[PDB]
Design a protein around this ligand. Sequence first.
Ligand SMILES: Nc1ncnc2c1ncn2[C@@H]1O[C@H](COP(=O)(O)OP(=O)(O)OC[C@H]2O[C@@H](O)[C@H](O)[C@@H]2O)[C@@H](O)[C@H]1O
Ligand SMILES: Nc1ncnc2c1ncn2[C@@H]1O[C@H](COP(=O)(O)OP(=O)(O)OC[C@H]2O[C@@H](O)[C@H](O)[C@@H]2O)[C@@H](O)[C@H]1O
Lengths: 20, 1306, 89
Amino acid sequence: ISNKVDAMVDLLDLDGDSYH
Amino acid sequence: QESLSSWIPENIKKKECVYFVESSKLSDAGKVVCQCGYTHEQHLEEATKPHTFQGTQWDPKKHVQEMPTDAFGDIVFTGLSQKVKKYVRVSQDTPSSVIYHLMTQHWGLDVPNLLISVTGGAKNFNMKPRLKSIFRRGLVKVAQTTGAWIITGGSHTGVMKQVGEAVRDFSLSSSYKEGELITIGVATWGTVHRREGLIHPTGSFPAEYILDEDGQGNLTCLDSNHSHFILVDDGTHGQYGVEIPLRTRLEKFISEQTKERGGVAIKIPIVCVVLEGGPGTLHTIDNATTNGTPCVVVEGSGRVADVIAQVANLPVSDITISLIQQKLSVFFQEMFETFTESRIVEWTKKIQDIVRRRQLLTVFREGKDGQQDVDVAILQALLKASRSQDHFGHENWDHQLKLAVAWNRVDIARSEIFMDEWQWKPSDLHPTMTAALISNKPEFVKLFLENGVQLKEFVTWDTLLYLYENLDPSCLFHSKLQKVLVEDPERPACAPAAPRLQMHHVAQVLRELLGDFTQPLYPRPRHGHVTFTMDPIRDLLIWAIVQNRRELAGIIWAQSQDCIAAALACSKILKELSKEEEDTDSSEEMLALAEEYEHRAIGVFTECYRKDEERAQKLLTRVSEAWGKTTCLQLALEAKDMKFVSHGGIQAFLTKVWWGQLSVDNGLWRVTLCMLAFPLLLTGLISFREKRLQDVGTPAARARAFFTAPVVVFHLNILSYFAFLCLFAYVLMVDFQPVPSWCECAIYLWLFSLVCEEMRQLFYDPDECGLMKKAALYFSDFWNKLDVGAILLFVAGLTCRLIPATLYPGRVILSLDFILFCLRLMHIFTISKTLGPKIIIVKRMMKDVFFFLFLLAVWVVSFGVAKQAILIHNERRVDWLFRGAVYHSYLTIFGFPEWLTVLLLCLYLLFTNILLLNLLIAMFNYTFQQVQEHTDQIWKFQRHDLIEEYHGRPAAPPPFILLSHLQLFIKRVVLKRHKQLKNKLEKNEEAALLSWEIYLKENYLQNRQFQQKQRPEQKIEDISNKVDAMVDLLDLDGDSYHVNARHLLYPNCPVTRFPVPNEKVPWETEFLIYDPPFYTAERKDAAAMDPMGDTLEPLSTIQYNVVDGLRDRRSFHGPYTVQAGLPLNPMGRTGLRGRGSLSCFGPNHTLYPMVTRWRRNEDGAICRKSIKKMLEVLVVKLPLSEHWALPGGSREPGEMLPRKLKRILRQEHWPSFENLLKCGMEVYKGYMDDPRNTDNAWIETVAVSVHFQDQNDVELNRLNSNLHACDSGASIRWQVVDRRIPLYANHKTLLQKAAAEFGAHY
Amino acid sequence: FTMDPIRDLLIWAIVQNRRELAGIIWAQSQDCIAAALACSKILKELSKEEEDTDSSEEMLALAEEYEHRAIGVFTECYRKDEERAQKLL
Ligand SMILES: Nc1ncnc2c1ncn2[C@@H]1O[C@H](COP(=O)(O)OP(=O)(O)OC[C@H]2O[C@@H](O)[C@H](O)[C@@H]2O)[C@@H](O)[C@H]1O
Ligand SMILES: Nc1ncnc2c1ncn2[C@@H]1O[C@H](COP(=O)(O)OP(=O)(O)OC[C@H]2O[C@@H](O)[C@H](O)[C@@H]2O)[C@@H](O)[C@H]1O
């Protein structure tokens, strides 16, 4: 269950100039 | 058996190359090979003759011939196994009816229930371990339950070896289980290593084949685990692939043509499955999927599996030939460079034509989080395919669900099979209920119950007999039933040896398990529609409880009749069984289930007692007609239901019946006070309940009821016993005298009356049990055993007193008699509040008091004979030495000689004064502490039987029990328990009582499951389900061508055509590798049809897109282009140059008429679909078409082209009248897709539709009477119209196009 | 190559009290019933002479777990077929 809710909180946290 | 060996050379053929057509490419050491080179310098098993024409490139149709087969028979592998295996060499073309008749009759294989055909890579196959795990459990587990037929290629290499090993070890590990997972292998006869030993011209009923994995060049050898073998021959030698069309053709005929049980047909379901493959695999899948068998592919497996699984959900037009070789060369990275462009276009065409038909395919997806089973995939691959294959099929609805039982998939069967569109009656679930029960599946029987099956209608008599015929043979009850049924002696005459199983047999073992007191449950017949017993549910509960099926019996008890007797009966049966279990795990669960049922009975009883006391009092004494005419309380006493009897209300009932007629509350001393005085009871000094006696004083009846109470009888009996023993002691003491005094005869007759009462205790039982069992039970009584021991000692002492010379011994013998009476006074303090437990304690402690007494005895006699031997000389004094030695030993045991005296006395204080007392300390601390708790319940349990006795005992004292004794003896000479313990109640009263308790049962159950929900593990499970639903919710946040034309396998003409993808179809796109064979039919050079099948000559001069006389060689769509004097398909490329079996080039014009009418109900109104209505068409079925199709003809004649379809079908003269009536409505005209299309000779149609609106008498009457149908055809009939109805798919396009003109359904 | 490598590998794992390792590699044993017995006997003969207040306890408990493993496999194979499993001892 702790792994489930950690995956859940990870998923809810988921929501140049060119010279020489 | 010789019918087979005669039958095979009659029936089956085998191929033979007859002529030497010597191959240009000489084989590897087979340089003498005539393009097959089987067994000669030539390809010949006869004279390689000129045969009047040495035809170069000898045609396999023309060279190779059929011959009768002799190579059949049986086989065994040399030392690798011990069993025998059947095998047949078979022709290339064989009717599958022949092979099915062979495998059924002359091999003895019954019809299956499932056909798994597994295919994979043979010589070059590699697999990860995870893939290996599914073969060991997933394939074997789904094969072994349903009784499948694993059919595969017969080879020792690759995947077929994996199936062969994984089915073998199951048969060894089954431990002599019945049945074997039957396996049939099919391989080509050409590529067999040592087949020259197999050909025996006579019937090779024994044979020996030794496999050798050395000499495998081109060929390969057989596997040794397959149980039947089929060897298709082709006449060729090294070819790979002559087994695929025969296997595919055979699988369909087995699946859908053999089972027709109550109806039209019912198809045995069938699944092809793949693991990893190559060019043999794609041809197998492509040939299979055209025949309607679904195919599941497995992800993460191998080469071909991954490249099919990647292109699963893609649109059909999105396949590029670049993308094919791109995805190909990465997975085929070993042999990626070995690919040519023709192989790429062939594989692109095959993958295209496979992923077109999205119904008939499924991916396993390799979900890999549970990696559940193949079963969850195979079930959905059944269900999607079954709906698409047919919509009117009912076999799948009932045949499929049963299969869904056996793999425990309730979510699937609820969601998919029980959505809608079945219209089942509930009793139709009866057989698929039964197998859900025998296979011990609680979830499906719960779902059938929630769907509406009635148990009370379900359990017939024969159903119950069949239920007991299939017990789990691992259990103890099956072994006991077999030990009875084998020892059943009264079955002399039958066809077999093992006679039958009758219900009185299981009744007989149940009576011996349950106890003697009940009657037999099932009667033996002394010899319809449905034989129904008194109650089905009791016997169902018995069947569930003997096999330790926990959650099942927990379910079905909720529908009981009288649950209180039921849970008692099951707890008693479980306790009587679990002692004899002899297994270290079955006994424990068997005990715990009985304890749970005790709890159930207690919980329902404390409810119904709390509802109403005095009514629930009647419940215990009630005889149950169900359980063999007994009441519950004696059954509970039999079961030692220790927690149950200890309830307060039942003990209050016992106290109420114990205190007799009067009120209960009088204490003990006031009872003795009114016992002492006669006329006090007539006064106002005592209590009475039943206030009619308390108010209205009838002192005769009041004293009668007072003496009727068993407390009074107990007290007068113990008082008479006390006076008897005191007078016996006084007369024994001083009145001993040789002549008989009056007092000795007085105590003798007192004892005589006492033993007549004790004999009456032996001779009462109206429950006609074993009289041997009755005497054993009374002899099992401890106090009765002491009583009869005292009787035997008394009658010994009386005849010793009779001898006048033995007066001193006999008298003191009677002295021991007095001791044997006073121990009976220990019988009192059972009725005490507290002391009875201590009586139980000393009754426990006597058991090791005895075997400690033995060891102390042998120790003290050893010390005594030592003490006798040490301090005396040897003398023969018999009465002088032994008596003084015994006196010295008793003086020891009642608790220069200095060194020896100190040694003797220190040994005496050493071993005697220390050790054995400590042994008793340990032993009696153990036998105390093992029982020092539950004994109060044991006393409460033991309270009953004395009350039982004294209610049974008459009220007279033993000085006056003879008045009752004579009356009872003359009553039983000239000609029954009390009603207060057992009574047949009134039936209507009993029905009210049963309805009352059965109402209270559900009130118990709700709060029971409610509090059972409040255990914390349940809330943990609920929270995990909540968060899994949460993570699921947060995870939630083509080009239309002539595809029936490009399809391979030109009908009725064994040729091929070129692989054409979706890119290179039209004439605009250039296809540089396009080289179709200039293919003509055999009848392409023939009668009135155009002879331009060989139009390379200048004979091709007929009119193009114009009417060349009667041949209207002009398209309805538009002008076709001409190249090299031949027309091209305006639709695109097909892959075959030429005319084919068509009449002429360009379009071949034909008319397809259709008849339509409405489908009426029983009333005559239009039957209704969900929105639209029902339509009927009249279709034909030819005897060698195996298909329904439209009666449409070629438009080579003008108006009789429907008669060219239907001169023989419709009529002769009335046909021209209906042709005059055939002026109807046109739906579609033009080019039609068809498998008989080359690039030159395609099909154009006109489609007319005529209709019947009225379904009475009008135009239809002319269609009825005119009919002259039975000419040269098999069948014609009207038919319902739906999207799943059988037909040619080309004609199904016409119906789906013309159904819009009338608004029918789809 | 010896008669069996896996027995000696199990010996190496079990003398150093490597718990989860030997728990893994026992799954590929040859005849596990003799094996778990041998390891429990070796653990009991070692843990008495351990002279450490923590190594002896875990050394004993692992042997008890291996006793349980041997019991659990034996009660399976006896329940499959009695008289054949009689020959095993
Ligand atoms: N019937 C056969 N038996 C043994 N080996 C074979 C066979 N057919 C082909 N092979 C060898 O297998 C090699 C290629 O094997 P794959 O491509 O992995 O397998 P594939 O050729 O796709 O064969 C599929 C095979 O499954 C069977 O159901 C069917 O008989 C078909 O031959 C080739 O070199 C070929 O010599
Ligand atoms: N559109 C189509 N869809 C499916 N099959 C077709 C189609 N057109 C032709 N066929 C099949 O091609 C085969 C050869 O075509 P014809 O013989 O020209 O068709 P037809 O004359 O309508 O059928 C003659 C019938 O007489 C029997 O001897 C024979 O079994 C065949 O069913 C037939 O078996 C027919 O089933």
